[PDB]
Write a protein that binds this ligand. Structure first.
Ligand SMILES: Nc1ncnc2c1ncn2[C@@H]1O[C@H](COP(=O)(O)OP(=O)(O)OP(=O)(O)O)[C@@H](O)[C@H]1O
Lengths: 79, 79
């Protein structure tokens, strides 16, 4: 007996499959109301010249280098 | 003995003659996100030709007419 089953309390994050046009409306909504879609992040996180749409944090590369060498992460910050 | 004092559980409305400029972002924020200011409501009231910025119900006219004849109002609607 063997079965893959279903995962109930966790959801697998599937990356987007298309490019969405980004208007100033989306920038204003993201920077004011906090509204965003995962396609926005997938579009601006594929390249790295897009400094007119998201603040590129330097901790991302260090965190990725740390996780790729078998080490867990614990992020803590303010409000 | 006489003293006007201060009113502590109610606030007094003050209109906004200063005509604030209106942009498309204010249209989007009001229609979608619910955020709006008092200057907006004062601006969309004085002139009745501003139909591309707010939906003008016909109930406000009847409520004003009912309150001008010393009748109190009760308004009930839904979510
Ligand atoms: N006359 C109008 N023109 C344009 N938009 C309107 C108008 N009336 C209401 N809306 C929109 O409908 C939404 C709900 O409006 P409002 O907050 O008045 O409902 P409500 O009855 O107060 O809701 P609740 O009953 O939960 O308090 C708001 O986002 C608002 O922008």
């Amino acid at each position: 007996d063997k079965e893959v089953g279903l995962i109930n309390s966790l959801e697998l994050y599937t990356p987007g499959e298309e490019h969405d046009e980004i208007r100033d409306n989306d920038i204003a909504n993201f920077m004011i109301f906090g509204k965003v879609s995962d396609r926005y992040i997938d579009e601006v996180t594929l390249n790295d010249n897009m400094h007119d749409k998201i603040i590129l944090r330097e901790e991302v590369s260090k965190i990725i280098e740390h996780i790729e060498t078998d080490n867990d992460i614990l992020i803590a910050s303010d409000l």
